[PDB]
Amino acid sequence: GDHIKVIYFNGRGRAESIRMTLVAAGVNYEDERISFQDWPKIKPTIPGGRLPAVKITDNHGHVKWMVESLAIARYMAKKHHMMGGTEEEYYNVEKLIGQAEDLEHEYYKTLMKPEEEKQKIIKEILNGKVPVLLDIICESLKASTGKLAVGDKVTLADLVLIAVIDHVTDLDKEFLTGKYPEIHKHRENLLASSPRLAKYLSDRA
Amino acid sequence: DHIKVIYFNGRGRAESIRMTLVAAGVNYEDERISFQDWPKIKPTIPGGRLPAVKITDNHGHVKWMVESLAIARYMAKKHHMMGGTEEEYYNVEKLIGQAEDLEHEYYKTLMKPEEEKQKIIKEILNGKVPVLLDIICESLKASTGKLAVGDKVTLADLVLIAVIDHVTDLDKEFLTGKYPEIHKHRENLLASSPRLAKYLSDRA
Ligand SMILES: N[C@@H](CCC(=O)N[C@@H](CS)C(=O)NCC(=O)O)C(=O)O
Ligand SMILES: N[C@@H](CCC(=O)N[C@@H](CS)C(=O)NCC(=O)O)C(=O)O
The missing domain is CATH 1.20.1050.10 (Glutathione S-transferase Yfyf (Class Pi); Chain A, domain 2)
Incomplete structure (x- = not known):
């Protein structure tokens, strides 16, 4: 039951490598864009305190976080050949x-x-x-x-x-x-x- | 195969390459380029930038590799x-x-x-x-x-x-x-x- 959320600020910044690798593999995900106004509050909640980050919540609600954009993209691309x-x-x-x-x-x-x-x-x-x-x-x-x-x-x-x-x-x-x-x-x-x-x-x- | 690491700085971008080969126990040769030899050597390196690794097999066929951490990850992948x-x-x-x-x-x-x-x-x-x-x-x-x-x-x-x-x-x-x-x-x-x-x- 995995849900993949992509957490980011800019529409075409460091998360694009992550979105395009999931798009080319046919893997669905949800976009969550953080505004400049909400960054103070959400910052302490992201491991490492920097975006983009990817939050993966399985069907039992257990969460796995991944950060570091191209480390996330290379993991997804490795998984999808x-x-x-x-x-x-x-x-x-x-x-x-x-x-x-x-x-x-x-x-x-x-x-x-x-x-x-x-x-x-x-x-x-x-x-x-x-x-x-x-x-x-x-x-x-x-x-x-x-x-x-x-x-x-x-x-x-x-x-x-x-x-x-x-x-x-x-x-x-x-x-x-x-x-x-x-x-x-x-x-x-x-x-x-x-x-x-x-x-x-x-x-x- | 002979592996030559071609670079300018002793502790710059080639260090990841040297340390990967060292950890793996793979020998190689260091070729440091001086500021004075760079004009003449630049046109000979594919891409025109260092560091670069030149691999010469025993038939003397050359394979070049560039982009420091692309070279390091290929050598590290090869050596688990x-x-x-x-x-x-x-x-x-x-x-x-x-x-x-x-x-x-x-x-x-x-x-x-x-x-x-x-x-x-x-x-x-x-x-x-x-x-x-x-x-x-x-x-x-x-x-x-x-x-x-x-x-x-x-x-x-x-x-x-x-x-x-x-x-x-x-x-x-x-x-x-x-x-x-x-x-x-x-x-x-x-x-x-x-x-x-x-x-x-x-x-x-
Ligand atoms: N190398 C990291 C860089 C992450 C980074 O620099 N994020 C910046 C914007 S893309 C950020 O989160 N700034 C907000 C902060 O540090 O509070 C990656 O590629 O994921
Ligand atoms: N990302 C490339 C950077 C290569 C690079 O910028 N080399 C610069 C020195 S750090 C260079 O060769 N400058 C000489 C030139 O461009 O003529 C790598 O990591 O190998």
Whole structure:
């Protein structure tokens, strides 16, 4: 009787890797979004005091908590055959995840800052590590033995990459227009390979 | 197969790779790149960033691996250091993520002049650094064994000692008389892995 609740603040922040892995596996869950106003009260109730967190309540009401977003995503993906099928494919899944998180860390430099400072940071990273990391990512994608990030079937790597690329276009929606063909291609391929994720992304949009 | 670890810093991102190979008893060769040789060597490394591992078989065929903790998790998976069940694998990844969030505060201080370094240090040590050390202490208390996850070495334990060495590099006294679970962890891990204790003692 397991119920999976995803507890988070932002609609497209660190929980997206967790929601997209459950969406691609066909696993239902409930979203519980915490407002800035309720964070003082709910904080002491989440183990570790940070979101996102996942609360799993079985049919006897016993609760299991999981925290640390991509540790939760990798556990769910491992359980649903989305962490590669060989130790080599697992290396390659991890390699792309680590490349996408280095890109996400540049994005995070822009968050929760006033307008003026945000724009200053944006101009610095987009002239900086952002394109360098999109080019590394394109070369990773080129090296796959299949049409997705690793082989031809969905992995956690594909889902962390579409989350991170949505963050880059959040900073400049034109940044990737007419460039980085492998990333565009990746996204078309993944939405063709995963009708659930395409429904999720289209519904969400 | 010959394994070469290619890197710049003696206690930077390649430490997770070295310690995993050490704990497993797998030999490798260190190739440290100087600031002066980096222009010429950069175009030869796939991705253009270190650390990188170059594996040459006895036919001299080369396989390259990049992305430090993607290399460490592949080697740890190969040597039964990524947990024995899917639950232990989650707990190994939980602590790694906690440790990397501490490492990211440490990285805010690097390759900065003295005065900016000092100012950044003062902000993180009064900030997310203790918050994260308490989170890690609570993780450590939840282990079903004496190490970070269960009772046998995992990658989690090696990433945590590398990150704790980074904190003490910023303030050698920061953990004196505090955070007992982390002191304890280090004593336990060095007692569980003579290779790593030999490696760390030699290194220091
Ligand atoms: N590495 C952690 C980071 C968790 C984290 O930084 N959470 C922030 C926002 S995403 C938070 O909970 N802030 C509120 C607080 O610390 O009180 C993960 O990926 O889950
Ligand atoms: N997440 C990557 C980070 C690699 C990285 O940032 N390397 C930096 C030094 S820490 C580098 O090689 N800089 C040299 C360059 O970019 O030319 C890893 O962990 O391996």
